[PDB]
Symmetry: D2
Subunit: 268 residues, 4 copies
């Protein structure tokens, strides 16, 4: 009776128990999905974290900047879910920008090598992952990535904003490719969520001014949101990702669904 009963779904992006992807994985399992997880670099950590999920899920290594990892990924997934089985869903919950590209470091002072690394991981990899996994996805399947609305500039987010603008564009092209397989591609634009790192940035890890600006952003977001916004609760975001992974948004692709309390629809 679960929303995702019988579905096989790959979830990337878990690194702590506060990762948005941890909550996506939890809700998906509560709703009957069978998962395969991917993790970057710290696999012992990630295994220990994902031991706390409701059900067992194989963990595979994936550095999206590593061409060998991407080239072997479909085979490794198929080994984990069984020959003759394919995926019904893929969750991209991956982002990175060097400190030069976010925070109080001036916008103009980010070297391109740093910006390029952030765009590789945060935007191009959405296409890389789709390339690798579409050949082992079933018709009716769904690829979902995580977005933070970049349509307006904001303090401190700087080149990560630019990376998210690129991601939104990439998603519209991935939809064209995915459609050939009967697969949808969409982003969920979430409101601000207090992951470990965000509390770190609020405590000043990227400069005092950036932390101050994020707290103002958070406060304004809840004010503007007609149904409010709880930055400590990723579950509403996770539910939205599961909606897109389900059979219930079958005519939506190349698109952005806003799980943000409605804040982006209100000026003040």
């Amino acid at each position: 009776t679960g929303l995702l009963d019988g579905k096989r779904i790959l979830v990337s992006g878990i690194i702590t128990d506060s990762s948005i992807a941890f909550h996506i994985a939890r809700v998906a399992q509560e709703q009957g999905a069978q998962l395969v997880l991917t993790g970057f670099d710290r696999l012992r950590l990630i295994q220990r974290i994902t031991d706390r999920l409701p059900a067992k899920a194989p963990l595979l290594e994936l550095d999206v900047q590593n061409e060998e990892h991407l080239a072997s990924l479909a085979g490794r997934v198929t080994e984990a879910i069984g020959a003759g089985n394919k995926l019904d869903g893929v969750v991209h919950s991956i982002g990175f920008m060097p400190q030069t590209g976010m925070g109080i470091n001036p916008f103009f002072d980010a070297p391109y090598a740093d910006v390029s690394k952030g765009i590789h991981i945060s935007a191009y990899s959405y296409a890389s992952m789709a390339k690798a996994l579409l050949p082992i996805m079933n018709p009716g399947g769904s690829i979902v990535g995580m977005d933070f609305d970049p349509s307006r500039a904001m303090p401190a987010y700087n080149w990560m904003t630019v990376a998210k603008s690129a991601l939104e564009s990439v998603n519209r092209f991935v939809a064209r490719e995915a459609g050939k397989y009967g697969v949808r591609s969409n982003l969920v634009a979430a409101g601000p969520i207090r992951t470990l790192a965000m509390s770190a940035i609020v405590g000043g890890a990227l400069g005092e001014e950036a932390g101050a600006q994020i707290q103002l952003l958070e406060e304004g977001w809840d004010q503007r949101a007609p149904i409010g916004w709880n930055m400590k609760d990723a579950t509403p975001v996770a539910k939205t990702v599961c909606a897109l992974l389900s059979d219930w948004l079958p005519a939506t692709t190349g698109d952005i669904i806003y799980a943000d309390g409605g804040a982006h629809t209100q000026l003040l």
Copy 2:
């Protein structure tokens, strides 16, 4: 195990078995919802049509231009669902524009009295219905209306486009009010669906040029849509409305969900 198990939902807008609202009502009942229906003017017809739905549903009269109908509506709904029970969902699937405001009649030749009637029924009534029903809606509830993307002009749709632009604005304000009740408000922007009337317009009911332009629109829509678009199948639209009525998009309000095959994300 239905998506809408236990939910009480009001559905407006059925007039034929090809009405988008007929399919919304059908899918909602398949998913366990208990419905109350509203109909305009031809109640004997509408009862005979809705006899074909999977389950029984009380039918109430509602002309959204009639202030007495709106003032009595909540009481009549409560009588139908039982004292002490409230609604969890409301579907607005209502639209109208006089022939002077659509088709081959020149854009400049639509008298304002005609445009005003179309905007009353197609846009203002979304607010009227929310005003009437929010006092008998439960927290966590959902109001959904039907949209046809008006962000660009198009042939023949003329003042109905303007009415839909107004509706989109109205929805953002209804979200502000609905949030006070813990209720969401959203639109579903559907691709073109061949209702009775649309085949009528294709057969030339509003002029030959308008019918020709609609057929070109339909053809282009399926071409652009990365997953295709079947104008003869309202079920994907109905499923999307049910997704918004469910618990699975809990952080989305004041917003527009596109159930259009992804066509609006592609230029060609």
Copy 3:
């Protein structure tokens, strides 16, 4: 050497010396335009006000809700500018919403007759004026209307927001008609300008909460604007309207130009 040398331009919307249209008219005359003015209801007042413009300009009566005024307008304009001469530009600087539709009166409590009057004057009349004047406009000509960005909801602006959403849609259709004459149609979306009435609303004319919200809006607008925003200075808006009336934006139509300090491009 003026930007608008030799051009004949109709300017509507002057009612006080703080009207945005007064400043449009002033700047247009400084730049060599020959004007015809239209005014509503208080023609003795408007004549006394426009006596202060740099140059003489005939004043014609125009109530945009009056069909007889609209039907005679082109003939009256031609009489004022001389047989055989046509207009090169038209400025629509007209808006109205009854107090029930703006301010602290609840959104749901605005009667449709009031909303309909506001939409007639604020949105439909953009089409009415184009219908009346396109037959006496020269190729290369330009129609400009005034907008306040309605893409997100905001406190108190309420049904005027809805009217501006309608206007934006109307403009895209007027562009289709105007193009047949070689004429452009565009809106200028201005930041908040302290007209007489706005100081009145700040002093509480539409309720204390509305005045408080407008002051917060004004303050936020200047903060967000990368080049700042001076609500006491309409000249930057007037210059932008003159740019659209000129020969220098010849490939822009159906569009919106933002003269708002850049505020709409920034979240905070």
Copy 4:
């Protein structure tokens, strides 16, 4: 009496007599601007081409991927225009994407090193150029870049679309920096212009299917445009850039002006 009388403007991006920047430079000189030009790699060619401009203009070498060129640029400009003089305008008319990232090569088959080079030149360099030149720009000045509307996906444009989405984001952040200097930053989103290279792509240089799709795009663009679109005429685009360089859009920044015949406002 020229629109840009007395203004000192840097124009990048000339490589042939069909370059959009060649036409920007020509119109700017016709309107009284004093120019400094920058060129990439083929300076003998570019000098011979720009000999045909109405007036003399110093040519400086600038490879935007070359950090030494960027670090010396302001000094070289100041030498060319005279100590104590500053720029009033900067035109970025620079774009590049390797063949793997455009045309018929599959979207998924573009290596990131190629995409990264295209984003460096086409998007990041807008920030690089602003960083280099803002210290020698006057208050009231204007930075303009060239855009091709990337809000929807399209055939063949592929990763260049993604680069333009990034550019639009970069422009909103450059506006924040430029505002500190009293300088505006905006993009002009042009319709398709038949430069040398575009005729090359139509003749099949990036594959037959891509050429076919571009011809369909061009045809549709003129159809949709309410005032038509002439792909052989860059002058309307050049005029629009000059409007933004002028004093007549003083409250517009972080924004996009569409010089596209109005096509983006029309669905069909």
